Design a binder for this molecule. Structure first.
Ligand SMILES: [Zn+2]
Lengths: 77, 330
């Protein structure tokens, strides 16, 4: 279990205790516990790449003190 | 009264892709990088490559329509536009969310295109201008944490392709937004840091510093809020020149100049319209240098520097909300 940082919609940082085996869905559920954003509205960016549902944090090499960036979807067309 | 600038026809809710494709067509070095990669792939095929092939086809289509309009501007009455059908096909192959005719995120489709170009480059290199995306859009962040108990420092290096700044605290400038992103923040309370030197939960200071810098800075504006998700339509006061030295690991004299804006129109976040503004950088194509083209799908308007800068202001409350800002290194 490791601690990671999430920079949220106001720029304000929160923490999460996660496993390298947790999935992006579980990370998004914890973010919902802390922020109130449904996991289907969440986009998580780590090191420039968006984290895909169905993968794990170890797939992305996210370790202690890695920072996710939380954005939403602004739909247009 | 048509300008010699090729718009893109909306193929059904596809302005998210159109405005990104315009910003990329006018990004300095992206056309040349795609042409180089396509030369490589075509020699390899005469001896995953479909994003490059279909971007190259779109780029040549835009170039040839511009040339034919400049040759016979009479065969062109209503609009000078083309369709990105093949490239939308390629995006639906690369990512099934673009199947159909729904509305999407411009920053997300930009991230998809650039990520796939980078994967193609890494494939070509591993098999063997193979660092197009890394040189144009990628930088280094140094993410420093200071325990407020023991006052020890831990660092991380992370890549970035854009800076996601807030537009609202919960008139403000882009500098305020970048400070909210990178100035020292103090994480406390429920968000205490776990220090391994203390083996305890502590309060901590986090700060970010730009280490290596791209040639193009993309600012992703978080123009959305949670209470229940809403859109923030009040913009920041956006500058024409930008320096990031206040948040850099070293002194720099490298400043940046705004060259492209993607705007969102709509009172919600679940729908709307994307438009792109682009700064222009054969003699007929120099009465436009320094002027701003507004790309509304197949319609192309021109605008002066000062009028464009005014239309961005929060005081003249705009209906197009800035969403992506593009700054290139001067
Ligand atoms: Zn400590």
């Amino acid at each position: 279990s490791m601690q990671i940082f999430v920079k949220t919609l106001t720029g304000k940082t929160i923490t999460l205790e996660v496993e390298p085996s947790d999935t992006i869905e579980n990370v998004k559920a914890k973010i919902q516990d802390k922020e109130g954003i449904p996991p289907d509205q969440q986009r998580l960016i780590f090191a420039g790449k968006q984290l895909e549902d169905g993968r794990t944090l170890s797939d992305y090499n996210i370790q202690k003190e890695s920072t996710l960036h939380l954005v939403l979807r602004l739909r247009g067309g | 009264n048509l300008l010699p600038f090729v718009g893109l026809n909306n193929l059904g809710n596809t302005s998210y892709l159109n405005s990104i494709l315009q910003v990329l067509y006018f990004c300095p070095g992206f056309k040349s990088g795609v042409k180089h990669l396509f030369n490589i792939i075509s020699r390899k095929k005469e001896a995953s490559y479909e994003l490059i092939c279909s971007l190259q086809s779109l780029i040549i289509s835009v170039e040839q329509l511009q040339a034919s309009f400049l040759l016979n501007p009479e065969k062109y009455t209503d609009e000078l536009a083309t369709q990105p059908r093949r490239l939308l096909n390629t995006l639906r192959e690369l990512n099934p969310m673009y199947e159909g005719y729904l509305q999407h995120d411009a920053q997300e489709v930009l991230q998809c295109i650039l990520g796939n170009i980078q994967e193609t480059c890494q494939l070509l290199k591993k098999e063997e201008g193979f660092e197009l995306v890394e040189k144009l859009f990628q930088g280094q962040l140094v993410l420093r944490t200071r325990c407020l108990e023991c006052e020890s420092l831990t660092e991380r290096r992370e890549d970035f392709q854009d800076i996601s700044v807030p537009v609202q605290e919960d008139m403000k400038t882009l500098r305020w937004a970048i400070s909210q992103f990178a100035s020292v923040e103090r994480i406390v309370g429920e968000d205490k840091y776990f220090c391994e030197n203390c083996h305890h939960y502590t309060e901590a200071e986090r700060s970010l510093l730009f280490d290596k810098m791209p040639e193009v800075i993309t600012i992703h504006l978080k123009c959305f809020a949670a209470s229940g998700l809403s859109k923030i339509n009040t913009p920041l006061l956006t500058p024409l020149k930008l320096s990031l030295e206040e948040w850099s690991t070293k002194p720099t004299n490298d400043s940046y100049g705004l060259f492209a804006v993607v705007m969102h129109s709509g009172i919600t976040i679940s729908s709307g319209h994307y438009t792109a503004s682009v700064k222009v950088t054969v003699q007929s194509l120099k009465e436009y240098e320094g002027k701003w083209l507004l790309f509304d799908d197949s319609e192309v308007k021109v605008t002066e520097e000062k009028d464009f800068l005014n239309s961005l202001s929060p005081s003249t409350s705009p209906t197009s909300t800035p969403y992506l800002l593009f700054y290139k290194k001067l």
